[PDB]
Amino acid sequence: SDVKAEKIKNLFNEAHTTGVLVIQQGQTQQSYGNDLARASTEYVPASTFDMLNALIGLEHHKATTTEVFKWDGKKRLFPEWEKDMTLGDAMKASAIPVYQDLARRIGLELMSKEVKRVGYGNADIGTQVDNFWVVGPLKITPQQEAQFAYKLANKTLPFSQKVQDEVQSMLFIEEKNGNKIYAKSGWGWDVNPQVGWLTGWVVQPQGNIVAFSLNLEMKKGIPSSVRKEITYKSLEQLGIL
Ligand SMILES: *C(=O)[C@@H]([C@@H]1NC(C(=O)O)=C(S[C@@H]2CN[C@H](CNS(N)(=O)=O)C2)[C@@H]1C)[C@@H](C)O
Numbered sequence: 001s002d003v004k005a006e007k008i009k010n011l012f013n014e015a016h017t018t019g020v021l022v023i024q025q026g027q028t029q030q031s032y033g034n035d036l037a038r039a040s041t042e043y044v045p046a047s048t049f050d051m052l053n054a055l056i057g058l059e060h061h062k063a064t065t066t067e068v069f070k071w072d073g074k075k076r077l078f079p080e081w082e083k084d085m086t087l088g089d090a091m092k093a094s095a096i097p098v099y100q101d102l103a104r105r106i107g108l109e110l111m112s113k114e115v116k117r118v119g120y121g122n123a124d125i126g127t128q129v130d131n132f133w134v135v136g137p138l139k140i141t142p143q144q145e146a147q148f149a150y151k152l153a154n155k156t157l158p159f160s161q162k163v164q165d166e167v168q169s170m171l172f173i174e175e176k177n178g179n180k181i182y183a184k185s186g187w188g189w190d191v192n193p194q195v196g197w198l199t200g201w202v203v204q205p206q207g208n209i210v211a212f213s214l215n216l217e218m219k220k221g222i223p224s225s226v227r228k229e230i231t232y233k234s235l236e237q238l239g240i241l
Pocket of ligand 1: 045046047048077078093094096134185186187188189224225226228
C-alpha cells in the first residue's frame with residue numbers, strides 16, 4: 001500500500017512534473033502521486049467537458065450519434081481534425097470545433113441550466129457558450145471528475161439511459177486482459193500553468209467499476225503521450241489493470 005503509493009509518486013517525478021491520480025471504487029476515493037493537493041484543486045476541464053457536452057446535446061435532441069459534422073476547410077490546431085466527423089470521432093480526437101458547434105446548438109441558457117442541474121465543478125459557464133471549458137470560468141477538481149466518471153459508468157447521471165449508453169460507447173478505448181477501458185484526455189494548453197487530464201473508468205472482468213482522474217501540470221514541451229502512460233502504469237501498480 002505504502003510501496004504502491006511511492007511507485008506512483010515516482011512515475012510523476014520521472015516525467016519531470018507534478019500530478020495526482022484519483023481512484024474511486026464504490027463511494028471511496030484514494031489519491032496517489034507527487035502532489036496530492038491537486039486532488040481537491042479546481043482546474044479548467046478542457047476537452048474532458050466533451051463528455052457532459054455530448055450528454056446535454058444528445059439528451060435535448062441537438063445532435064445524433066450518426067450525423068456528420070462537415071469540416072468547413074479552415075485550418076485547425078491539429079491536421080488530424082481537418083475532416084468530417086461524428087460526435088464519437090470528435091470525442092476520440094478531442095476535436096473541439098465539433099464540440100463548439102454542439103455547444104452553440106445547445107445555447108448558453110440550456111447549457112448553464114444543465115451544468116448546474118448536474119452540479120459539474122463550480123458550475124459557472126459565464127457568457128460565451130462556445131468558450132467556457134478551456135480558459136474559464138468553468139473549473140472542476142480531479143475528485144469531481146472521478147465522481148462524474150463513476151456516475152457515467154453506472155449510468156446514474158440524471159440523463160436518459162439511452163444517452164449515457166451512447167456517450168459510454170464514444171469513450172471506449174480497448175479491452176485489455178478482460179478489462180474494458182473508457183477514457184477522455186484533456187489538455188488546457190491556454191491557461192498558466194497548463195493542465196493535463198485523463199478521466200475515465202475500468203470495467204474489471206466481474207463488472208466492478210474503477211473510476212479514475214489523472215491531473216498533472218503540462219510543463220512546456222512535455223510529451224502529450226505521458227498522460228496515458230502514467231495512468232496505465234499507475235492502474236497496473238494498483239492491480240486495477
Ligand atoms: C482538449 O483538452 C484539447 C485537446 N485535447 C487533446 C488531448 O490529446 O487530450 C489535444 S492534443 C491532440 C489530440 N490528441 C493528440 C495527442 N494524442 S496523445 N496520445 O496524447 O499523444 C493531439 C487537444 C489540445 C482541446 C481544447 O484542444
